[PDB]
Amino acid sequence: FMAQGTLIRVTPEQPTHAVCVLGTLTQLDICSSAPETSFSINASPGVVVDIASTWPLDPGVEVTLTMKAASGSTGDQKVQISYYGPKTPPVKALLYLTAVEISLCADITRTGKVKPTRAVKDQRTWTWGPCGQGAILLVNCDSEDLQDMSLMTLSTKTPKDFFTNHTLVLHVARSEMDKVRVFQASVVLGPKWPSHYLMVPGGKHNMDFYVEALAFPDTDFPGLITLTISLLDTSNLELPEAVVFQDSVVFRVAPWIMTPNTQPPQEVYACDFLKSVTTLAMKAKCKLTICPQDEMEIGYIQAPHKTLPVVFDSMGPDFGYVTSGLDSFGNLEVSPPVTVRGKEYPLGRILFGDSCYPSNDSRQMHQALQDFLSAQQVQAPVKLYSDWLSVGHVDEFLSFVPAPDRKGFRLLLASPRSCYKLFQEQQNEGHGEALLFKKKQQKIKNILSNKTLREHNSFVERCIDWNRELLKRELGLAESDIIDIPQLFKLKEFSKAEAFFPNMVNMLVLGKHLGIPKPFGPVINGRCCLEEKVCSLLEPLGLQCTFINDCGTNVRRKPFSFKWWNMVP
Ligand SMILES: N[C@H](C(=O)N1CCCC1)C1CCN(c2nccc3c(-c4ncc(Cl)cc4Cl)cccc23)CC1
Ligand SMILES: [Ca+2]
């Protein structure tokens, strides 16, 4: 609550006239310029004097002043210092104080409700987590347009004639200058004005500022912006302006957060089988639009006062937009809230594809995408191995669905051996002539006999196995949280993998209703074994399995109730 101020050096010769800012301790320099033994001090009834009624001239006397109420006029409040001694008659040092109030209120407590600066301890350092301090900013991503902006106010109670000899200046550091825009009740601090002179009148006067952030956190911007108020002494026309008081709030720009398959959906977008999508969406109770691809992704940015969705593209609604094969949002899945060896990741962890080691022929996601994901912190990315895939996307062999038990979810992984065992269970029963089914059909007896297909699917198993162990470690996962979806592959151009039949992990999870790509499996006794196997896997967790066909569609899911600012990266 109690902030630190300047030192006021009084002298027995002339009197001293200082200003003191309500909420700041002020130190008094009695020992300098004093003559010669002991000293008393008596002040005006609105000046609190802590010493640490008679005291000596030892230089170890911390004389500290604080003001009790803002002033009516200049030198409203007086302070007098005695410098008596044993044989010396008391010598007076005068000090005339002028109380003022200068407070920056802004939402530093992250409760939605703007609070004054003297309400935190360290107003100048932004800290994560609950019990933390630091106001939030939303990026622009594009009256009532104040809604997507932060509130910052200045409340000042000063004498009538105060700003004749003082002035207030609002200012932002030049390095943060191009990343913020501050409006007055009109742009004051901007991307080319690092400081602006407030015209404030005497007396009591609250004036309001609106702050938007102009860019997201990144390797050239850790995400902090501090706006600072400075009180300037422009009295003595000869000498320059002397600062007498500075105070500031620190904003952190809200990062972009991504949503996992396990968040409740809100809207489905799409621009034939669109009937079967509308049907799934009807059953899941969720909105759906049509405009007459997965090169975008719909996240959200969140501050106490306003949450809104934002779309990133590598026009549509979603009130906000921002703009090799591995560089696609198909190569970005987001885990559910998890805790690994005690560390909580309550907004998930972002999984993206990559090679295992860099070579000539190895691909990687562009370094500036990886660095931007990482720069948001809140969802500590996790590099995976997917370069073995023709396309390269993580979405090609993993997905998450909601479960009512264990950790509340399951990780689906594609599994060639899961499919082989099913086909072998089928052939062992005399169904090797069951034809599977991008056209040439094959009976399962041929497919299991294909020794080459066996090697591809063994190697592919080793790839997905490698990633399995990665997910286990980086997501603190127990096998009991993993469900292997039978799925075949084939190695095509440049010995990269391709989904043998429709990639069933690449599914639409709309709450508990799954739209799964129809594999066109071998029909055994009027029931496709592959569908039957996947229902058998997912229905115990109470998912509703529906098999479709095959631009695509996207999904906007409800943001986490957990507020990113309470995590501690
Ligand atoms: N200064 C700008 C800013 O903050 N603005 C612009 C005006 C509004 C606010 C930054 C925006 C973010 N921007 C990006 N940096 C990395 C990646 C990006 C991706 C992406 N593309 C593909 C994948 Cl798979 C993953 C990702 Cl995140 C999409 C879209 C933008 C991106 C860096 C410049
Ligand atoms: Ca994805």
Coordinates of C-alpha atoms and ligand atoms in Angstrom, one line a residue:
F1 CA 0.0 0.0 0.0
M2 CA 2.7 2.6 0.9
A3 CA 4.9 3.7 -2.0
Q4 CA 8.3 5.5 -2.0
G5 CA 8.9 9.2 -2.8
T6 CA 11.7 11.7 -3.2
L7 CA 13.9 13.3 -0.4
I8 CA 12.9 16.8 0.6
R9 CA 16.1 18.7 1.7
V10 CA 15.1 21.5 4.0
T11 CA 17.5 24.3 5.1
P12 CA 17.3 26.7 8.1
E13 CA 18.2 29.5 5.7
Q14 CA 15.4 29.8 3.1
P15 CA 12.1 27.9 3.4
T16 CA 11.4 24.9 1.2
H17 CA 8.2 24.3 -0.9
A18 CA 7.8 20.7 -2.0
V19 CA 4.9 18.7 -3.4
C20 CA 4.0 15.3 -1.9
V21 CA 1.9 12.7 -3.7
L22 CA -0.7 11.0 -1.6
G23 CA 0.3 7.4 -1.2
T24 CA 4.1 8.0 -1.2
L25 CA 6.4 8.2 1.7
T26 CA 8.6 11.2 1.8
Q27 CA 12.1 11.4 3.4
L28 CA 13.3 14.6 5.1
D29 CA 16.9 15.7 5.1
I30 CA 17.3 17.3 8.5
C31 CA 21.0 16.6 9.0
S32 CA 22.2 18.2 5.8
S33 CA 22.3 22.0 5.9
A34 CA 21.5 22.0 9.7
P35 CA 23.8 24.0 11.9
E36 CA 24.8 22.7 15.3
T37 CA 22.9 19.2 18.8
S38 CA 19.3 18.2 19.1
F39 CA 16.1 18.9 17.1
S40 CA 12.4 18.8 17.6
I41 CA 9.7 18.7 14.8
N42 CA 6.1 20.0 14.7
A43 CA 3.9 20.0 11.6
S44 CA 0.5 20.9 10.3
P45 CA -2.3 18.5 11.4
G46 CA -2.4 16.7 8.0
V47 CA 1.3 15.8 7.9
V48 CA 2.2 12.5 9.7
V49 CA 5.8 12.5 11.0
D50 CA 7.5 9.2 11.8
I51 CA 10.9 9.3 13.4
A52 CA 13.1 6.2 13.6
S53 CA 9.2 14.8 21.0
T54 CA 13.0 15.3 21.2
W55 CA 15.7 13.8 19.1
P56 CA 19.4 14.4 18.3
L57 CA 21.4 15.4 15.2
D58 CA 22.7 11.9 14.6
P59 CA 22.6 11.1 10.9
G60 CA 20.8 7.8 11.7
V61 CA 17.4 9.5 12.2
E62 CA 15.0 8.4 9.4
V63 CA 12.6 11.3 9.3
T64 CA 9.7 10.2 7.0
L65 CA 6.7 12.3 6.1
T66 CA 3.3 11.2 4.7
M67 CA 0.3 13.2 3.7
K68 CA -3.1 12.6 5.1
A69 CA -5.3 14.5 2.6
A70 CA -4.9 16.4 -0.7
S71 CA -4.4 20.1 -0.5
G72 CA -6.8 23.0 -0.8
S73 CA -4.1 25.3 -2.1
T74 CA -0.3 25.7 -2.4
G75 CA 1.6 25.2 0.8
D76 CA -1.7 24.3 2.4
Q77 CA 0.3 22.2 4.9
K78 CA 3.5 23.4 6.7
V79 CA 6.4 21.6 8.4
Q80 CA 8.8 23.3 10.8
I81 CA 12.1 21.9 12.1
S82 CA 13.9 23.1 15.2
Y83 CA 17.7 23.0 15.5
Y84 CA 18.2 23.9 19.2
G85 CA 21.3 22.9 21.2
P86 CA 22.5 23.1 24.8
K87 CA 23.3 26.9 24.8
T88 CA 21.8 27.6 21.3
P89 CA 18.3 29.2 21.0
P90 CA 16.1 27.1 18.7
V91 CA 16.7 27.7 15.0
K92 CA 13.8 27.1 12.6
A93 CA 13.8 25.4 9.2
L94 CA 10.6 25.9 7.3
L95 CA 9.0 23.5 4.8
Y96 CA 5.7 24.2 3.0
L97 CA 4.2 21.1 1.5
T98 CA 1.4 20.9 -1.1
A99 CA -0.6 17.7 -1.0
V100 CA -1.9 16.2 -4.2
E101 CA -3.5 13.0 -5.3
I102 CA -2.3 11.4 -8.5
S103 CA -3.4 7.8 -8.9
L104 CA -3.5 5.4 -11.9
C105 CA -6.3 3.0 -11.4
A106 CA -6.4 0.0 -13.8
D107 CA -7.4 -3.6 -13.5
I108 CA -4.2 -4.7 -11.9
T109 CA -5.9 -7.2 -9.6
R110 CA -7.5 -9.0 -12.6
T111 CA -11.0 -9.0 -11.1
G112 CA -12.6 -7.0 -13.9
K113 CA -12.9 -4.0 -11.6
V114 CA -10.3 -1.2 -11.9
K115 CA -8.3 -0.6 -8.7
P116 CA -5.9 2.2 -7.7
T117 CA -2.2 1.7 -7.9
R118 CA -1.6 1.9 -4.1
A119 CA -3.6 -1.4 -3.8
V120 CA -0.8 -3.8 -4.9
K121 CA 2.6 -4.0 -3.4
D122 CA 4.8 -3.9 -6.6
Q123 CA 2.8 -2.0 -9.1
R124 CA 5.8 -2.0 -11.6
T125 CA 6.2 -5.8 -12.0
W126 CA 3.7 -8.2 -13.7
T127 CA 3.4 -11.5 -12.0
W128 CA 1.6 -14.8 -13.0
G129 CA -0.8 -16.8 -11.0
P130 CA -3.5 -16.1 -8.4
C131 CA -2.5 -13.7 -5.7
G132 CA -0.7 -11.9 -8.6
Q133 CA -0.6 -8.4 -10.0
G134 CA -0.7 -7.1 -13.5
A135 CA -3.4 -5.8 -15.9
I136 CA -4.4 -7.6 -19.1
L137 CA -4.6 -6.2 -22.7
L138 CA -6.4 -7.7 -25.7
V139 CA -5.0 -7.4 -29.2
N140 CA -7.0 -5.5 -31.7
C141 CA -7.5 -8.2 -34.4
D142 CA -9.8 -6.1 -36.6
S143 CA -18.6 3.5 -29.1
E144 CA -19.2 -0.1 -28.2
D145 CA -15.7 -0.8 -29.6
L146 CA -14.5 0.1 -26.1
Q147 CA -15.7 -3.4 -25.1
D148 CA -12.5 -5.0 -26.5
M149 CA -10.3 -2.5 -24.7
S150 CA -8.8 -2.1 -21.3
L151 CA -9.7 0.6 -18.9
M152 CA -7.1 2.8 -17.2
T153 CA -8.1 5.9 -15.2
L154 CA -6.3 8.8 -13.6
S155 CA -7.8 10.3 -10.5
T156 CA -6.2 13.5 -9.4
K157 CA -7.2 15.8 -6.5
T158 CA -5.0 18.8 -6.5
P159 CA -5.2 22.6 -5.7
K160 CA -6.9 24.9 -8.2
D161 CA -3.6 26.5 -9.2
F162 CA -1.7 23.3 -9.2
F163 CA -1.0 22.7 -12.9
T164 CA 0.1 26.3 -13.5
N165 CA 3.5 25.2 -12.2
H166 CA 3.3 21.4 -12.7
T167 CA 2.2 19.2 -15.6
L168 CA 1.3 15.5 -16.0
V169 CA 2.7 13.5 -18.9
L170 CA 1.5 10.0 -19.9
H171 CA 4.2 7.9 -21.6
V172 CA 5.1 4.5 -22.9
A173 CA 8.6 3.1 -23.4
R174 CA 9.8 3.6 -27.0
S175 CA 10.4 -0.1 -27.4
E176 CA 6.8 -0.9 -26.3
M177 CA 5.5 2.2 -28.2
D178 CA 4.5 0.5 -31.4
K179 CA 2.6 -2.3 -29.6
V180 CA -0.1 -0.3 -27.8
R181 CA -2.7 2.4 -28.5
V182 CA -4.1 4.5 -25.6
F183 CA -7.2 6.7 -26.1
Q184 CA -8.5 9.5 -23.9
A185 CA -12.2 10.0 -23.0
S186 CA -8.2 10.9 -29.1
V187 CA -5.1 8.7 -29.2
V188 CA -2.6 9.9 -26.6
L189 CA 0.2 7.2 -26.5
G190 CA 0.6 5.5 -29.8
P191 CA 2.9 3.6 -32.1
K192 CA 4.6 6.8 -33.0
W193 CA 4.1 9.0 -29.8
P194 CA 5.9 7.5 -26.8
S195 CA 4.6 10.4 -24.5
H196 CA 1.8 12.9 -24.5
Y197 CA 1.1 15.9 -22.3
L198 CA -2.1 15.5 -20.3
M199 CA -4.1 18.6 -19.9
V200 CA -5.5 18.2 -16.4
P201 CA -7.2 21.0 -14.4
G202 CA -7.0 21.8 -10.7
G203 CA -9.3 20.3 -8.2
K204 CA -10.6 16.8 -8.3
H205 CA -10.7 15.2 -11.8
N206 CA -11.0 11.6 -12.9
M207 CA -10.1 11.1 -16.6
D208 CA -10.3 7.8 -18.4
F209 CA -8.0 6.0 -20.8
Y210 CA -8.7 3.0 -23.1
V211 CA -5.8 0.7 -24.1
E212 CA -5.7 -1.8 -26.9
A213 CA -2.7 -4.0 -27.6
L214 CA -1.5 -3.9 -31.2
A215 CA 0.5 -7.1 -31.4
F216 CA 0.7 -10.6 -29.8
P217 CA 3.6 -11.9 -27.7
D218 CA 6.5 -13.2 -29.8
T219 CA 10.3 -13.5 -29.8
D220 CA 10.5 -9.7 -30.4
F221 CA 7.9 -9.0 -27.7
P222 CA 7.7 -10.9 -24.4
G223 CA 4.2 -9.4 -24.0
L224 CA 4.7 -6.7 -21.4
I225 CA 3.7 -3.0 -21.8
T226 CA 3.9 -0.5 -19.0
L227 CA 2.2 2.9 -19.2
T228 CA 3.7 5.5 -16.9
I229 CA 2.4 8.8 -15.5
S230 CA 5.0 11.4 -14.5
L231 CA 4.4 14.5 -12.4
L232 CA 6.7 17.4 -13.6
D233 CA 7.7 20.6 -11.9
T234 CA 7.5 23.3 -14.5
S235 CA 7.6 26.2 -12.0
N236 CA 11.1 27.7 -12.4
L237 CA 11.0 28.8 -16.1
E238 CA 14.8 29.1 -16.2
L239 CA 15.7 25.5 -15.3
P240 CA 14.2 22.5 -17.2
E241 CA 11.4 20.3 -15.9
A242 CA 12.1 18.4 -12.8
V243 CA 10.3 15.1 -12.3
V244 CA 8.8 14.9 -8.8
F245 CA 6.7 11.7 -9.1
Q246 CA 6.3 8.7 -11.4
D247 CA 3.8 5.9 -11.3
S248 CA 2.8 3.3 -13.8
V249 CA 0.7 0.2 -14.5
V250 CA 2.1 -2.9 -16.3
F251 CA 0.0 -4.6 -18.9
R252 CA 0.5 -8.1 -20.2
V253 CA -0.9 -8.8 -23.7
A254 CA -3.3 -11.7 -23.7
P255 CA -1.7 -14.6 -25.6
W256 CA -3.6 -16.6 -28.2
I257 CA -5.0 -19.8 -26.7
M258 CA -6.0 -22.9 -28.7
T259 CA -8.9 -25.2 -28.0
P260 CA -8.7 -29.0 -27.5
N261 CA -11.2 -31.5 -28.9
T262 CA -12.4 -31.9 -25.3
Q263 CA -13.7 -28.4 -24.9
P264 CA -17.5 -28.2 -25.5
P265 CA -18.1 -27.0 -29.1
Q266 CA -20.0 -23.8 -29.8
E267 CA -20.2 -23.3 -33.5
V268 CA -19.4 -25.5 -36.5
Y269 CA -18.5 -23.7 -39.8
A270 CA -18.3 -25.2 -43.3
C271 CA -17.8 -23.6 -46.7
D272 CA -23.3 -33.6 -49.9
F273 CA -21.9 -35.0 -46.7
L274 CA -22.6 -31.6 -45.2
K275 CA -26.0 -33.2 -44.5
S276 CA -24.3 -35.8 -42.3
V277 CA -22.4 -33.0 -40.6
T278 CA -25.7 -31.1 -39.9
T279 CA -27.1 -34.3 -38.4
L280 CA -24.2 -34.9 -36.1
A281 CA -24.4 -31.2 -35.1
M282 CA -28.1 -31.5 -34.5
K283 CA -27.5 -34.4 -32.1
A284 CA -24.7 -32.6 -30.3
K285 CA -26.8 -29.4 -29.8
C286 CA -24.4 -27.0 -31.6
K287 CA -24.7 -24.2 -34.2
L288 CA -23.6 -24.6 -37.8
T289 CA -23.2 -22.3 -40.8
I290 CA -22.5 -22.7 -44.5
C291 CA -20.8 -20.2 -46.9
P292 CA -21.4 -20.7 -50.8
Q293 CA -10.2 -25.4 -45.2
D294 CA -8.0 -26.6 -42.2
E295 CA -5.4 -23.9 -43.1
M296 CA -6.9 -22.0 -40.2
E297 CA -7.6 -22.5 -36.5
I298 CA -10.1 -20.8 -34.2
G299 CA -8.6 -19.9 -30.8
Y300 CA -9.5 -17.3 -28.2
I301 CA -7.9 -14.3 -26.4
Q302 CA -9.1 -13.6 -22.9
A303 CA -9.1 -10.8 -20.4
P304 CA -11.2 -10.4 -17.2
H305 CA -13.6 -8.0 -18.9
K306 CA -13.9 -9.5 -22.4
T307 CA -13.2 -12.9 -24.1
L308 CA -13.4 -13.2 -27.8
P309 CA -12.5 -15.8 -30.5
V310 CA -9.7 -15.2 -33.0
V311 CA -8.9 -17.1 -36.2
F312 CA -5.4 -17.6 -37.4
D313 CA -4.7 -18.4 -41.1
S314 CA -1.4 -19.8 -42.4
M315 CA -14.2 -13.7 -45.1
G316 CA -15.4 -15.5 -41.9
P317 CA -17.0 -14.2 -38.7
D318 CA -15.6 -15.3 -35.3
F319 CA -15.0 -11.6 -34.4
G320 CA -11.3 -11.5 -35.1
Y321 CA -8.7 -12.7 -37.6
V322 CA -4.9 -12.8 -37.8
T323 CA -2.5 -13.8 -40.6
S324 CA 6.5 -26.6 -46.2
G325 CA 3.6 -29.0 -45.4
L326 CA 4.4 -29.1 -41.8
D327 CA 3.5 -25.4 -41.4
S328 CA -0.3 -26.1 -41.2
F329 CA -2.8 -26.0 -38.4
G330 CA -3.3 -29.6 -39.4
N331 CA 0.1 -30.0 -37.7
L332 CA -1.2 -28.6 -34.4
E333 CA -3.3 -30.5 -31.9
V334 CA -4.0 -29.3 -28.4
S335 CA -4.0 -31.7 -25.4
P336 CA -6.6 -31.4 -22.6
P337 CA -5.8 -30.0 -19.2
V338 CA -3.1 -32.3 -17.7
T339 CA -0.6 -32.4 -14.9
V340 CA 2.8 -34.0 -15.5
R341 CA 5.1 -34.8 -12.5
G342 CA 3.3 -32.1 -10.5
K343 CA 3.3 -29.4 -13.1
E344 CA -0.2 -28.2 -14.1
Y345 CA -1.0 -27.4 -17.7
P346 CA -4.6 -26.4 -17.2
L347 CA -5.1 -25.1 -20.7
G348 CA -3.5 -28.1 -22.4
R349 CA -0.2 -28.4 -24.2
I350 CA 0.2 -27.7 -28.0
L351 CA 1.5 -30.7 -29.9
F352 CA 3.1 -30.1 -33.3
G353 CA 4.8 -32.3 -35.8
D354 CA 8.5 -32.3 -36.7
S355 CA 11.3 -34.6 -37.6
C356 CA 13.2 -36.5 -35.0
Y357 CA 16.6 -35.1 -36.2
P358 CA 17.3 -32.5 -38.9
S359 CA 18.7 -33.8 -42.2
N360 CA 18.7 -32.6 -45.8
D361 CA 15.5 -34.5 -46.6
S362 CA 13.9 -33.8 -43.3
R363 CA 11.1 -31.2 -42.9
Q364 CA 10.3 -29.1 -39.9
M365 CA 7.6 -26.6 -38.9
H366 CA 8.9 -23.1 -39.7
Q367 CA 11.0 -21.7 -36.9
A368 CA 8.8 -18.6 -36.5
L369 CA 5.7 -20.7 -36.1
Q370 CA 7.3 -22.8 -33.3
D371 CA 8.6 -19.6 -31.7
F372 CA 5.3 -17.9 -31.8
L373 CA 3.4 -20.9 -30.2
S374 CA 6.1 -21.0 -27.6
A375 CA 6.0 -17.2 -27.1
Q376 CA 2.4 -17.5 -25.7
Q377 CA 3.8 -19.7 -22.9
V378 CA 0.3 -20.7 -21.6
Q379 CA 0.3 -23.9 -23.6
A380 CA 4.0 -25.0 -23.6
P381 CA 4.4 -26.6 -27.1
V382 CA 5.5 -30.2 -27.4
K383 CA 7.5 -31.2 -30.5
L384 CA 6.5 -34.6 -31.9
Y385 CA 7.8 -36.9 -34.7
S386 CA 5.5 -36.7 -37.8
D387 CA 7.9 -36.1 -40.7
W388 CA 7.5 -39.8 -41.5
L389 CA 4.0 -39.0 -42.9
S390 CA 3.5 -38.0 -46.5
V391 CA 1.6 -34.9 -45.5
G392 CA 3.3 -34.6 -42.1
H393 CA 0.4 -33.7 -39.8
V394 CA 0.0 -34.7 -36.1
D395 CA -3.7 -34.8 -36.8
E396 CA -3.0 -37.8 -39.0
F397 CA -2.3 -40.2 -36.1
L398 CA -3.6 -38.7 -32.9
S399 CA -6.8 -37.2 -31.5
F400 CA -8.4 -36.7 -28.2
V401 CA -12.0 -37.4 -27.0
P402 CA -13.8 -36.8 -23.7
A403 CA -14.1 -39.6 -21.3
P404 CA -16.1 -39.6 -18.0
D405 CA -13.5 -41.5 -16.0
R406 CA -9.7 -41.4 -15.2
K407 CA -8.3 -38.0 -16.1
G408 CA -11.5 -37.1 -18.0
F409 CA -10.2 -37.9 -21.5
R410 CA -8.5 -40.4 -23.7
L411 CA -5.8 -40.1 -26.3
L412 CA -6.7 -41.8 -29.5
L413 CA -3.7 -43.1 -31.5
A414 CA -3.7 -44.8 -34.9
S415 CA -2.6 -48.4 -34.6
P416 CA -1.6 -50.7 -37.4
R417 CA -1.3 -53.7 -35.1
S418 CA -4.8 -53.1 -33.7
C419 CA -6.1 -53.4 -37.3
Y420 CA -4.0 -56.4 -38.2
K421 CA -5.2 -58.3 -35.1
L422 CA -8.8 -57.6 -36.1
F423 CA -8.2 -58.7 -39.6
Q424 CA -6.4 -61.9 -38.3
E425 CA -9.3 -62.5 -35.9
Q426 CA -11.5 -62.2 -39.0
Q427 CA -9.4 -64.5 -41.3
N428 CA -9.0 -67.1 -38.5
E429 CA -12.8 -67.4 -38.8
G430 CA -12.8 -68.1 -42.5
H431 CA -13.5 -64.5 -43.9
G432 CA -10.3 -64.0 -45.8
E433 CA -12.4 -63.4 -48.9
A434 CA -14.1 -60.4 -47.2
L435 CA -13.3 -57.5 -49.6
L436 CA -12.1 -54.3 -48.0
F437 CA -13.4 -51.1 -49.7
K438 CA -8.4 -45.0 -54.1
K439 CA -10.4 -47.7 -55.8
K440 CA -8.6 -51.1 -56.3
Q441 CA -10.4 -53.5 -53.9
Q442 CA -8.6 -56.3 -51.9
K443 CA -9.8 -59.2 -49.7
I444 CA -8.3 -59.3 -46.3
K445 CA -6.6 -62.6 -47.1
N446 CA -4.4 -60.7 -49.6
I447 CA -3.9 -57.8 -47.1
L448 CA -2.5 -60.0 -44.3
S449 CA -0.5 -62.1 -46.8
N450 CA 1.1 -59.0 -48.2
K451 CA 4.5 -59.2 -46.4
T452 CA 5.4 -55.8 -47.7
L453 CA 2.3 -54.2 -46.2
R454 CA 3.4 -55.9 -43.0
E455 CA 6.7 -54.1 -43.0
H456 CA 5.3 -50.7 -43.8
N457 CA 2.8 -51.1 -40.9
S458 CA 5.5 -52.4 -38.6
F459 CA 7.7 -49.4 -39.3
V460 CA 4.7 -47.0 -39.1
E461 CA 3.9 -48.7 -35.8
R462 CA 7.5 -47.9 -34.6
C463 CA 6.9 -44.2 -35.6
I464 CA 3.6 -43.9 -33.8
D465 CA 5.2 -45.9 -30.9
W466 CA 8.0 -43.4 -30.7
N467 CA 5.4 -40.6 -30.4
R468 CA 3.4 -42.6 -28.0
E469 CA 6.4 -42.5 -25.6
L470 CA 6.8 -38.8 -26.2
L471 CA 3.1 -38.1 -25.3
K472 CA 3.5 -40.3 -22.2
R473 CA 6.4 -38.3 -20.9
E474 CA 5.4 -34.8 -21.9
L475 CA 1.8 -35.2 -20.9
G476 CA 2.3 -37.5 -17.9
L477 CA 0.0 -40.2 -19.4
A478 CA -0.9 -43.7 -18.3
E479 CA -1.7 -46.4 -20.9
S480 CA -5.2 -46.4 -19.3
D481 CA -5.6 -42.9 -21.0
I482 CA -4.8 -44.2 -24.5
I483 CA -7.1 -45.9 -27.0
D484 CA -5.6 -47.5 -30.1
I485 CA -7.8 -47.0 -33.2
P486 CA -7.2 -49.7 -35.8
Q487 CA -5.7 -48.1 -38.8
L488 CA -3.6 -49.2 -41.8
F489 CA -1.0 -47.3 -43.7
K490 CA 1.2 -47.6 -46.8
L491 CA 4.5 -46.1 -47.7
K492 CA 4.2 -44.0 -50.9
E493 CA 6.3 -41.2 -52.4
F494 CA 9.8 -40.9 -50.9
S495 CA 9.0 -43.7 -48.4
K496 CA 6.5 -41.5 -46.5
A497 CA 3.3 -42.9 -45.0
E498 CA -0.2 -42.5 -46.2
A499 CA -3.5 -43.6 -44.6
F500 CA -4.3 -46.9 -46.2
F501 CA -8.1 -46.5 -45.8
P502 CA -9.9 -43.3 -44.5
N503 CA -7.9 -41.9 -41.5
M504 CA -10.3 -42.6 -38.7
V505 CA -8.4 -40.7 -35.9
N506 CA -8.8 -37.6 -38.1
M507 CA -12.4 -37.3 -36.7
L508 CA -14.8 -34.5 -35.7
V509 CA -15.3 -34.6 -31.9
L510 CA -18.3 -32.5 -31.1
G511 CA -18.7 -33.1 -27.3
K512 CA -19.6 -36.8 -27.0
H513 CA -20.7 -37.2 -30.6
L514 CA -18.0 -38.4 -33.0
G515 CA -18.2 -38.0 -36.7
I516 CA -15.7 -40.7 -37.9
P517 CA -14.5 -41.1 -41.5
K518 CA -16.2 -44.2 -42.9
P519 CA -13.3 -46.7 -43.4
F520 CA -15.2 -48.9 -45.9
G521 CA -14.1 -52.0 -44.0
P522 CA -14.7 -55.6 -44.8
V523 CA -18.4 -56.3 -44.2
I524 CA -18.7 -59.4 -42.0
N525 CA -22.2 -60.7 -41.3
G526 CA -23.8 -57.4 -42.2
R527 CA -21.5 -55.4 -39.8
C528 CA -18.2 -53.7 -40.7
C529 CA -15.7 -55.1 -38.2
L530 CA -13.7 -51.8 -38.2
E531 CA -16.7 -49.7 -37.2
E532 CA -17.7 -52.4 -34.7
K533 CA -14.2 -52.3 -33.2
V534 CA -14.3 -48.6 -32.9
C535 CA -17.7 -48.4 -31.4
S536 CA -16.6 -51.1 -28.9
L537 CA -13.6 -48.9 -28.0
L538 CA -15.3 -45.5 -27.6
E539 CA -18.9 -46.2 -26.5
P540 CA -17.7 -47.4 -23.0
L541 CA -16.6 -43.8 -22.5
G542 CA -20.1 -42.8 -23.7
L543 CA -19.2 -41.4 -27.1
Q544 CA -21.8 -41.5 -29.9
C545 CA -20.1 -43.0 -33.0
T546 CA -21.3 -41.8 -36.5
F547 CA -19.5 -42.6 -39.7
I548 CA -19.4 -40.1 -42.6
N549 CA -17.7 -39.5 -46.0
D550 CA -14.2 -38.2 -46.9
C551 CA -12.3 -28.4 -48.4
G552 CA -13.5 -29.5 -44.9
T553 CA -15.0 -27.9 -41.8
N554 CA -13.7 -26.2 -38.6
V555 CA -15.0 -26.0 -35.1
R556 CA -15.1 -23.3 -32.5
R557 CA -15.0 -24.7 -28.9
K558 CA -15.8 -23.0 -25.6
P559 CA -12.6 -21.5 -23.9
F560 CA -11.3 -23.0 -20.7
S561 CA -12.9 -21.7 -17.6
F562 CA -9.4 -21.5 -16.2
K563 CA -8.1 -18.0 -16.8
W564 CA -4.7 -18.2 -18.4
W565 CA -3.2 -15.5 -16.2
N566 CA -3.5 -17.8 -13.1
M567 CA -1.2 -20.4 -14.6
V568 CA 2.5 -20.1 -13.8
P569 CA 4.5 -21.1 -16.9
Ligands
LIG1 N1 2.5 -8.8 -35.2 C1 1.4 -9.7 -35.5 C2 0.3 -9.4 -34.5 O1 0.4 -9.7 -33.4 N2 -0.9 -9.0 -35.1 C3 -1.1 -8.7 -36.5 C4 -2.2 -7.7 -36.5 C5 -3.1 -8.2 -35.3 C6 -2.1 -8.8 -34.3 C7 1.8 -11.2 -35.4 C8 0.5 -12.1 -35.6 C9 0.9 -13.5 -35.4 N3 2.0 -13.9 -36.3 C10 2.2 -15.3 -36.6 N4 3.3 -15.8 -36.1 C11 3.5 -17.2 -36.2 C12 2.5 -18.0 -36.6 C13 1.3 -17.5 -37.1 C14 0.3 -18.3 -37.6 C15 0.4 -19.8 -37.7 N5 0.4 -20.3 -38.9 C16 0.4 -21.7 -39.0 C17 0.5 -22.5 -37.9 CL1 0.5 -24.2 -38.0 C18 0.6 -21.9 -36.6 C19 0.5 -20.5 -36.5 CL2 0.5 -19.8 -35.0 C20 -0.9 -17.8 -38.1 C21 -1.1 -16.4 -38.1 C22 -0.1 -15.6 -37.6 C23 1.1 -16.1 -37.1 C24 3.2 -13.1 -36.1 C25 2.9 -11.6 -36.4
CA2 CA -5.6 -30.1 -35.1

